[PDB]
Structures are given as structure tokens and as C-alpha cells.
Amino acid sequence: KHPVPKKKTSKARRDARRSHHALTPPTLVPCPECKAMKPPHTVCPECG
Amino acid sequence: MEAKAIARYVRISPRKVRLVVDLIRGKSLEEARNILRYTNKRGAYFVAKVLESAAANAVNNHDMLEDRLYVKAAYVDEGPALKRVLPRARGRADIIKKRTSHITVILGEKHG
Amino acid sequence: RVKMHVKKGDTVLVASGKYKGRVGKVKEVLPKKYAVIVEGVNIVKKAVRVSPKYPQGGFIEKEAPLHASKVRPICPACGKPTRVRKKFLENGKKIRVCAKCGGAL
Amino acid sequence: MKRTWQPNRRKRAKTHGFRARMRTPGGRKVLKRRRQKGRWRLTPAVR
RNA sequence: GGGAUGACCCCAGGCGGUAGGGGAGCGUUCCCGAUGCCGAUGAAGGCCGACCCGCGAGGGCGGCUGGAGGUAAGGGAAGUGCGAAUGCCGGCAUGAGUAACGAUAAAGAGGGUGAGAAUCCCUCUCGCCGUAAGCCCAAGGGUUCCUACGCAAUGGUCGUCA
């Protein structure tokens, strides 16, 4: 019982683990009346 | 000419806040402005503050002409970590570290 | 307990530093720092907050203390001496071994 | 579950107390040592 | 052998190596050398070097940093060289954005405050205790009580609340 890691994992291998960890920016559309930006299919912070 | 802001000893984890910083790098100040607002991370707040101070500092200090601002380079280094004791089973007591980020946004002028 | 040489009355010469060469009168003397302040020699610029007077004001000029060793008593007619002590009756003195004179006041 | 410290202010002054220590040579030497080490409190503090 | 009584040319050989024996050196702290010498036209320390000397330990030189010390030749004396001791003290990693966030009594909305609110305040609805999860007393604790101003930390999130 009680499993443990056998080797400190390397700076190479943990960083490669993280290759998927990167964020993707919010999805945004120009607003119908106001100048500003909005997520699509939502109610605009300005001029709802 | 180029202008910066550095938020220091921000109580938040460098690993965590670095992620949103990556979202806005090389972005025109205006897309960077839109990206952080709709990003959902506790660190979008803190970066947006540093973004602005540098935007302020740019126009307001180094006479940089706002409309052409982009994010030249930017990054968070790791500040000094405060340690606290987390009591555990059978008397044991580990220590967890609440960390610290030094956020840096560096602004420069677009060439158009 | 600290013995000095110059006192408040004195006219002294600043014998070293930025203000080397200049004579003036010791305005105050701080035995515990071994420092004399000679008005108006050593002046500095302190920045100061906008509470009342300097209510607008941001900057004051003030005269900084000097290491009591930097200055020397002037001795009427010269710019030397050190110390000497004449006794007579009953006691006390300062004379110039340069020589031989007051302080006094 | 019932543990080892069950504080009672009389027991403390009666057992580790100052008059306690002073009654017995064993205990005068307790005070002698504590005094010599320069302890701030020679004897438990009970309220 | 070269007769230079030698520090040196020539010739001929030997030189795998653990426990061990032997020999020569490098370097660190300190003393005499020193009331001297180096030094702000930059000491010790640090960071570089593809350069010079040494077989090697090392020594030079050069640039950058640093900003007040260093210490030749010759000799003397030692708290003198670390990679390992489940060594000692510290610092920072890995596991990992993983396990958890501590009773499955349960929450929803509207409004207020505030830079900022699932987490504070009020209202409404819902749920849970009720020989208690309510109220009194004794220990023990020691200002935690009340109220104003606060949110760095403490609060397993947040906090404008405590």
C-alpha cells in the first residue's frame, strides 16, 4: 500500500506535462448598439 | 520610448497568474483590455491593474500617445512566500506556502 | 560626560569637506552625537508635507550637524589653535597656544 | 477523550507552589537553581 | 658519462595498481618581514575569458561588478581543503495545480452597503435542533464583553464580516 513517486520528476518532464495547460482567450463579438465588446449570446454590459 | 508598471508582493501564486499574463502579450492595448475583462481568473484582476498603471505611466509620464500602445513584453517573477502551518492527522503538521507574485507589464509604441 | 572643544558661543572654522574653508558661529552643539551645527554652513534640502505652514510648501532648507571634529575654534586674530588651559586663581580657562586668548563667551 | 491536563488552580498552587517548594530541601534547591539560571518566573503562575 | 661540483645537454632504461610505506608540492587562517609596500587613477569578495605560466593542486592577466581594505620575497604556527556519515543548520525543488477544504441539517430570491459581495446587513420563502443543537450554575479560561474606525495577516474560499 501507500504508492509514492520513485524519482523527482524532471524540469523537462513537468513542463511538457503542462503543454496543454495554456489558456485560450475569451470568445468575443462587437455589440449591436454600443461600441463595446461582448461574449456572444449574452446580454451586453452596456445597452442591454 | 517604453513604459512599465510592476505590482509587487501580490498575494497570489506565480504559476496561477502567469497563465493570464500569457493571454495578453504582444496584444494591442485595446485587445489586452478586452481579454482580461472577460477572462475568468483571480489573476485577471491583478494584471489589468498593472496594465493600466503602465498605460497611465506611458501617456502621462513618458509622453507615449495612447492610441498606439501595445504590450511589448511582460511577466511575473516569484516573490517571497509566506509559510503557514497546516495541522494534520496523528499530530503531524505540514507547512503550506501562500506565495507571491511580482507582475510586470512593459508597454511600447506600435509603429503604424 | 563627553568633553568636546567648541561651545555655542564660538565662532569656528569648517576645516574639511564641502564646506571647508568657511567660518561661522556654532549655533547648537550636540555632545551625545559629537556634533556641532554651525549656522549657516551645512545646508540641506528636506522635502515636507502639505499640512499647515508649508501648507502649500514642499521644500525646506535646513543646516545639518557636523562632526564636532570637522570644525576648529577661530582664536581672535588667527584661525588656528587647539586648547591650552591657564589656571591662575581660583580656576578655569581656554587659551590659544597659538597664542594666548579668550573663550570666555 | 479525557486527556492529561485537567487544570485546577488549587492543585497547582498546592503542588508546584512557592510555599510548596520552600517546605522541602529538595524544593528549596529547585528555587536555588531557577534563581541562579535567572528564570523570570521561579514557580508556576496560577491565577 | 658531459667535470658546471653539478642544476644543463646527450645517451640508456623503468613508470597498471586496492590495503598500505615513502617523497616532493599547491592552497586557507594567523605571526615576524612592517613606523614598510599595494590602494578611491579602486583593497578583499563577486561575475566572465577562446589569453599566459604550471604535469596537477594552483598562479597570472584582462573586462564587468564592488567600494575599503590587501599584504611580496624569506621564514614561523594551525580550529587548514568535504559529495556521501537514514550526518547538522538553512534555503529552494518533485509529487501537482494533484488530495483535500473537517459531519449529507439545505438552501432561493429581492433590496441595502462597498473600489470590489455566493460568503456582510435587511426582508421574504425553504430546511434542521427542541431531556437541545434552548436556558441557568460550578470549573477552567482571562477582556474574548460593548461601540467607533479598519482588512496586511489570522478565518481551510471570500469578506465590506469576526
Place this chain on the structure above:
RNA sequence: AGCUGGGGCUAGGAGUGAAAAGCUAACCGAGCCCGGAGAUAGCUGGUUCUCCCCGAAAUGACUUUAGGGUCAGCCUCAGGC
């Protein structure tokens, strides 16, 4: 032979025990602290710059000796022949 609050007494080769070597302040076939103390350890670990030369033993005898020793053997250095 009930449970329980408060106040007391008994303790280290000693107490207490409807007896398990149980318990005696979260490890009791002999408590904890400070001291004798740097106890002892024929055992385990560890032992820090460089270059040059040479270079072993794992056998014999005795040994409350057998994974430790003393003498011999085998290495090395100096002087001698």
C-alpha cells in the same frame, strides 16, 4: 462488588493491581528530568587539495579464540654489506 463532583493520601525496585507483568501524565518486564557523561560499543557508517615512486594479505602457531587480537610470514623506507 453501581455510577459521579469536590477535598485528600500512597511512587520508582517503589506504589497501586477482582492479577494483564496491568497502570503509575499519549511507548513501563522497572517513570521522567538533570547529573556521573564525551559511560562502554572487539559493531555499522563517515573521514575533506595535487603530483611522483614502490606495493601487499585473505596463511601458520596460540587465543572463553573463531567477523578481535599477539608473534611469525608477505609491503615500504633509512642506513650498512
Place this chain on the structure above:
RNA sequence: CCGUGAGGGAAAGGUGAAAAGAACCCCGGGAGGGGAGUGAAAUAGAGCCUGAAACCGUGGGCUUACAAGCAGUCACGGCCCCGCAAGGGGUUGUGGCGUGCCUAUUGAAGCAUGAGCCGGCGACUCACGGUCGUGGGCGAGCUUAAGCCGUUGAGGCGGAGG
């Protein structure tokens, strides 16, 4: 701070010559920062001398998605860089070769011990005796101890004794 108690028992020094410790303005709730100003120096700004290493991060050069490994080494080649070039630095495609360090053992890459990594602390000494060797003094002799006198860190006397 730990312990009921006797008792155990830490960490933690350094701005600058001088506070001249940064008024004022800008982003900001603040913290923090950007200009201004001080200062010889402000990556000396108070989490303040020097500021190593592990460790984290941004930018650049070379490189890698049909190879397979104690990670190096030998060779050639491609790219980038320094130049006087026959030159040198970086990186690494393909090809040769290649069983970690220490410890302990007849034998370890060993699937036997120890070690996450870095920095610092860390183990053949001293006294008196003994015994060899060596550098000197005096040699049928050699030599003083306690003590006495003297002394800028000045030595001499002292013959009991061995």
C-alpha cells in the same frame, strides 16, 4: 516556545559621509509602481553593504515530432557568432564507441548501503611520558627545575636534581 513539574531551550547584527528616509504629480481602494527630487552611487529606497548556489521567469541563437536512453566521448557535416586567415566559440544531424558516484564484498550497472538539489558546519589533536629518525649546541660530560632579579613582547641568574 515546549513541558503538570523538575526541566528543556531558539532564532534574529550591517541604508548613507550625512536622513539629505524621497514634498509634489500620475495609475491605484490599498499595496505597489511611473515621473520629480536627494545622493559620489538609489538593481545604496528602508524586505536597504557585498549579493554566490540551488530554484522560478522573460528575450535571443542553434535544435528536436520514424527513434531507443548512465545522456557522455571521437568524427564529419549544417546553422549562428568573433576575426588576419590555415583560425576559434555556440549548437547538434548522422556514424563509431560506451553498465552512474560512494560504500561494502571473492564478486555490484547492479533488483545490495547511503544520497531530492544548493550553500554553510562537519572527523588523526593536545599534554606529559617513551621510542626511533633528523637539524643543531656542548662533549667525559651534557643539562638545569621551582624560584630570584630584570624587561617598549630584553633577558639573565638559579646545579636541589636528572
